[PDB]
Design a protein around this ligand. Structure first.
Ligand SMILES: [Mg+2]
Ligand SMILES: [Mg+2]
Ligand SMILES: [Mg+2]
Ligand SMILES: [Mg+2]
Ligand SMILES: [Mg+2]
Ligand SMILES: [Mg+2]
Ligand SMILES: [Mg+2]
Ligand SMILES: [Mg+2]
Ligand SMILES: [Mg+2]
Ligand SMILES: [Mg+2]
Ligand SMILES: [Mg+2]
Ligand SMILES: [Mg+2]
Ligand SMILES: [Mg+2]
Ligand SMILES: [Mg+2]
Ligand SMILES: [Mg+2]
Ligand SMILES: [Mg+2]
Ligand SMILES: [Mg+2]
Ligand SMILES: [Mg+2]
Ligand SMILES: [Mg+2]
Ligand SMILES: [Mg+2]
Ligand SMILES: [Mg+2]
Ligand SMILES: [Mg+2]
Ligand SMILES: [Mg+2]
Lengths: 81, 119, 177, 160, 118, 138
RNA sequence: AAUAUUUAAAAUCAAAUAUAUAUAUAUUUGUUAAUAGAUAAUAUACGGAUCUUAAUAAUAAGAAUUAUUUAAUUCCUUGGAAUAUUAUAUUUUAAAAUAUAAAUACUGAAUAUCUAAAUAUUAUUAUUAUAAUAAUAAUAAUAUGGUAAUAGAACAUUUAAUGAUAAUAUAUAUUAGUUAUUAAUUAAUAUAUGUAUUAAUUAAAUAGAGAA
RNA sequence: AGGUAAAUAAUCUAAAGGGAAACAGCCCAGAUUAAGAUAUAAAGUUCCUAAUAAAUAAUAAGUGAAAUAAAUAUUAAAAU
RNA sequence: AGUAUGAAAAUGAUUAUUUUAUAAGCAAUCAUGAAUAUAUUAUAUUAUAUUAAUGAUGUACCUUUUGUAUAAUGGGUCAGC
């Protein structure tokens, strides 16, 4: 999706972390494209958090609802991976 | 004394503040009573309510009990009262001839401002 | 900053550190009439909210782009990389020609035990994923590997199988949003 | 409506450090502060029916403040049940036996609510007389805080 | 009162007060008032007036009350009804007389049909 | 890759078009039977007609049976209230009928303190998080 | 410094209020603390934890004791005004200036109000059919804890008088609904019965049992 | 004397609710049924436990912190 | 001590659901997770029912007394009287 649009490559980064070396940690990771954050993802593991950030980003992409005052938004199709 | 009436010999800070507030309220009530009477008397003479309220010369109450209450020697105000008379009654059978007002029954309703001159 | 509204915490009249759950204190707290900025005390993971969506995902004719609400509180310079591939850290390389690819394919079919993905990657300066994308192994090798995996699974206790199932369920749940 | 959403982060057990060398509170006040955290009263999602309180790692507990002459006077009691077995230990003696962390724990226990979750809450408190401790690596941290800390110290901590 | 962010936002909540009882709502929410409404019948629409707070995710307009011109907030009266019937017993400790305190309070189910910045 | 999860919508009766909860009422009486006197009187005396005129979305069935007099309502959700109106006067019967028409069909239920609003909607503000709070704890 | 008393606002002084009023008169208020003395038998016993502060160094603690107070502090007459505080926003160069707000401390009962419901009385209405009545519904007010006791109103059960109806019915039981509910009713299920001394009004009672 | 005898008032008796750790008789306050927004009473506001911030003095004895133990002694402190 | 019938209870064994081996007191009520069952309008992010996670409140009943959780009276339980 980032490639398709005029966006920098997305990378996931630890924002906040607590309870590493426990039964139930909390890892907050943000998928940044440049300095802009696209998706925020919490998780018990790092991997999980990363996944969640990506899913959040995708949700924000797809479930974007424009205003009625805006001129019509025709999307450029589904992101064919 | 096997039954335990666990009442402390002295009052808390919060209790004392409440007592003070109560004392202030009774003074306020008295003031209102005198004020209303004055207003009524002004009206009888023939002034409007506002004019009566403005009036320089306030009329003192003619009835006896009210007049006594107005006097601070008989019935002092909370600001006038001593620290001791706010929180301590006179009790002739106590040591110190003094007893906490909170130990008086129905002290929240019953008023007792004036203690004897040297007790 | 487009808007210059005063900003407020979600204020109780009581001690917030001791009585955060006490709704009564919140109910009591009146604040002067007007517009405020109450920044949300929440992660924006499940939210489809318009104040949560980033500006790049908003349309060009969206009025909301200009307004300052998708706040960039974090900074990418300060945050460290998590589970990032080696291609992302040092860029993608498209160096291997057709001949090299063909050689790799030949090698992999011939002997996947000797010429494994990692070894190929090491040889040609490329990713194991890319090697996989390029070349299939001999299907026999794959079958053997599947059989080994099945044997391992069988070797488990009841508890381990259940745990694996739970893990799988959790994984599935992650991608829901 | 307010309740509906992802609640996993709200009910997340965080880990709270307190360097007793830095903290200027006396023992009892510190214990009281800890108790709330342990219960989970600090967090608005709290409910009495649910244990939802955080971990508290106390460290450098040897430098804990105790007013008056309580260190040589204050007596900690104990009793099995058999008469003539009342065990009374002064605070300094208790410290010598176990540490200042034990003392803190006792205070925190007394602060906590007396029910089935009390023990769990007490367990979540992790006290240490000196500096070094295993939970060093799991105290809540943020990326914005990292500039304050020097470069090699972080690496050393990670290694530890 | 620059009420532009609220107007823009897709999600939006209100904290309207009926008889000083606050109810935090979005559109579609189903309020359950703990009394019998006499004025409105079932099917009637209620235009909420004492609206304390109107909030987005990050902003909120607040008034005592908010200007009626700025918003709309239409509830629909979707059934007067009652709570479940209960009978707690009242009695003293060496007394065979046990007075039954029967109770079955009234309810009014509203539904918040419309909520938007005008 | 993205895949759908098959899911169905939830009807909120009020928001678009209000469908009236009470759909049908059955007045049941007995020609014999002294308990059915007030019901019989109600049926006779021009009140029922007025009622029907007022509420043309409800259908008003009138039945005769040997037992006690009955008021059974029928609601949109599929539930059925049945009130026995034995030995009640005309006015009491009418009040009962009014009560029935007022009801949304749902079962009676104990509510806890301040259990007021019932939302399908996700919170407009998020759910709280300790990492994302304004004031950090200590 | 020394000796010896007193621990006091009566006098005295200071401060405040009220009458003529830059003063006089009358009233009101203001005068120690610590320790020792100290003390028994299941076990420490403020209800328990615990409370006494500390620069460096915290966006941060410093009685949780005793005494006199306040609801940010200071003047003026509950109220306003000024002062700095705190928080926030804006502008300028982490600071300065401008402005908005907070100053109504809070908790707390089955108290009071509000919000609805019930009964009773008083006073007004409305609707429907001793109509100066009855039923139902409004509004305002007052009342509704209760042993001994007094008074009023109901229900379940059984018998007698009158009495439609019917296995698509009735009775009894179980479960789940309904009606402000010791009761009855709806549905399902079960077993009986070709069927209620049935609904209703009267008359009566071997008429209601965790208490001998 | 938690004694006894009467006098006056209140409560209990026959009164549930809040406070007084627990509590017939103390401090508030009288349950027709709910509801739980607002005023509150007595009593409270570090935690257990619903709720708090200040000011000026004094204490250092854990004195004391809701059940005040005396004569006397010692050490200070003011005033004359 | 008639004859039929008898899911009347106390009472026993067994099965099912659910809770329970770090927790302390009339064993209930209210709050509140979870698990299970039923549901020919669960459209569901559903509804009811059952069940000692966890939290809070809670000193059997009667009699007799100035006054009873009382370690005062009386009752083993249920059915009929
Ligand atoms: Mg009793
Ligand atoms: Mg008695
Ligand atoms: Mg004098
Ligand atoms: Mg002792
Ligand atoms: Mg205490
Ligand atoms: Mg009341
Ligand atoms: Mg009565
Ligand atoms: Mg009999
Ligand atoms: Mg019996
Ligand atoms: Mg009985
Ligand atoms: Mg008696
Ligand atoms: Mg009385
Ligand atoms: Mg009582
Ligand atoms: Mg009453
Ligand atoms: Mg609290
Ligand atoms: Mg002590
Ligand atoms: Mg004591
Ligand atoms: Mg266990
Ligand atoms: Mg206990
Ligand atoms: Mg007793
Ligand atoms: Mg006994
Ligand atoms: Mg016993
Ligand atoms: Mg016996």
């Amino acid at each position: 999706l980032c490639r398709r649009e005029g966006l920098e490559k997305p990378v996931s980064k630890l924002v906040a972390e607590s309870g590493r070396l426990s039964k139930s940690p909390v890892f907050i990771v943000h998928v940044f494209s440049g300095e802009e954050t696209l998706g925020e993802g919490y998780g018990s593991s790092l991997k999980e958090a990363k996944a969640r950030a990506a899913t959040d980003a995708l949700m924000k992409w797809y479930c974007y609802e424009p205003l009625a005052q805006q001129e019509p938004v025709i999307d450029p199709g589904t992101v064919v991976v | 004394g096997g039954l335990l009436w666990k009442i402390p010999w002295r009052m808390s800070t919060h209790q004392k503040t409440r007592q003070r507030e109560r004392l202030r309220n009774v003074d306020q009530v008295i003031k209102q009573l005198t004020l209303g009477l004055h207003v009524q008397r002004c009206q009888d003479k023939g002034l409007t309510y506002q004019e009566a309220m403005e009036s320089k010369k306030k009329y003192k109450p003619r009835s006896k009990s009210l007049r006594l209450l107005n006097k601070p020697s008989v019935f002092p105000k909370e600001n006038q009262m001593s620290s001791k008379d706010k929180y301590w009654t006179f009790d002739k059978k106590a040591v110190g001839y003094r007893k906490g007002i909170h130990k008086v029954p129905k002290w929240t309703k019953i008023s007792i401002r004036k203690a004897p001159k040297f007790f | 900053k487009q808007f210059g509204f005063p900003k407020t915490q979600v204020t109780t009249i009581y001690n917030k550190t001791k009585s955060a759950s006490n709704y009564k204190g919140y109910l009591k707290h009146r604040d002067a009439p007007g517009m405020y900025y109450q920044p949300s005390e929440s992660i924006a993971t499940g939210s489809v909210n318009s104040e949560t969506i980033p500006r790049s995902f908003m349309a060009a004719s969206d009025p909301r782009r200009g307004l300052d609400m998708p706040v960039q509180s974090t900074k990418a310079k300060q945050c460290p990389n998590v589970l990032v591939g080696k291609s992302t850290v040092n860029g993608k390389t498209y160096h291997l020609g057709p001949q090299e690819i063909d050689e790799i394919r030949k090698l992999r079919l011939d002997n996947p035990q000797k010429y494994t993905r990692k070894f190929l990657a090491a040889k040609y300066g490329i990713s194991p994923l890319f090697v996989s994308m390029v070349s299939k192994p001999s299907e026999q090798h794959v079958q053997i590997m599947e059989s080994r995996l099945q044997e391992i699974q069988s070797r488990w206790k009841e508890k381990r199988r259940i745990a694996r199932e739970d893990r799988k369920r959790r994984k599935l749940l992650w991608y829901q949003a | 409506s307010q309740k509906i959403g992802h609640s996993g982060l709200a009910f997340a057990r965080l880990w709270h450090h307190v360097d007793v060398a830095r903290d200027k509170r006396t023992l009892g006040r510190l214990a009281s502060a800890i108790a709330i955290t342990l219960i989970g009263r600090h967090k608005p999602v709290y409910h009495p029916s649910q244990d939802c309180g955080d971990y508290v790692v106390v460290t450098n507990c040897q430098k804990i403040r105790v007013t008056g002459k309580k260190f040589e006077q204050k007596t900690y009691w104990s009793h099995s049940g058999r008469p003539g077995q009342l065990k009374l230990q002064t605070m300094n003696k208790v410290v010598a036996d176990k540490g200042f962390g034990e003392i803190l724990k006792k205070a925190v226990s007394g602060m906590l609510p007396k029910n089935k979750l009390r023990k769990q809450r007490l367990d979540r408190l992790k006290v240490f007389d000196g500096s070094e401790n295993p939970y060093k690596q799991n105290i809540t941290a943020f990326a914005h805080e990292q500039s304050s800390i020097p470069e090699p110290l972080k690496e050393s901590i990670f290694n530890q | 009162t620059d009420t532009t962010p609220l107007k823009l936002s897709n999600e939006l909540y209100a904290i309207f007060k009926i008889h000083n009882r606050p109810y935090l709502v979005t559109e579609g929410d189903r309020v359950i008032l703990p009394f019998k409404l006499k004025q409105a019948e079932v099917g009637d629409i209620l235009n909420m007036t004492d609206v304390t707070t109107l909030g987005s995710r990050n902003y909120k307009l607040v008034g005592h009350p908010i200007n009626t011109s700025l918003y709309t907030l239409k509830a629909t009266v979707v059934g007067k009804t009652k709570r479940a019937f209960q009978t707690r017993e009242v009695t003293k400790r060496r007394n065979r007389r046990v007075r039954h305190a029967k109770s079955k309070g009234d309810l009014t189910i509203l539904r918040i049909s419309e909520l938007s910045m005008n | 890759v993205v895949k759908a999860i098959a899911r169905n919508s939830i009807g909120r009766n009020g928001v678009g078009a209000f469908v009236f909860p009470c759909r049908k009422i059955t007045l049941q009486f007995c020609n014999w039977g002294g308990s059915s006197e007030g019901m019989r009187k109600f049926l006779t005396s021009k009140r029922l007609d007025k009622w029907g005129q007022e509420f043309p979305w409800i259908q008003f069935e009138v039945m005769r049976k040997s037992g006690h007099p009955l008021l059974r309502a029928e609601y949109t959700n599929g539930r059925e209230k049945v009130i026995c109106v034995r030995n009640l006067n005309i006015d009491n019967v009418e009040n009962k009928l009014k009560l029935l028409k007022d009801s949304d069909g749902d079962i009676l239920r104990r509510r806890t303190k301040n259990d007021n609003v019932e939302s399908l909607n996700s919170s407009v503000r998020g759910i709280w998080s300790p990492l994302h709070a304004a004031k950090r704890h200590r």
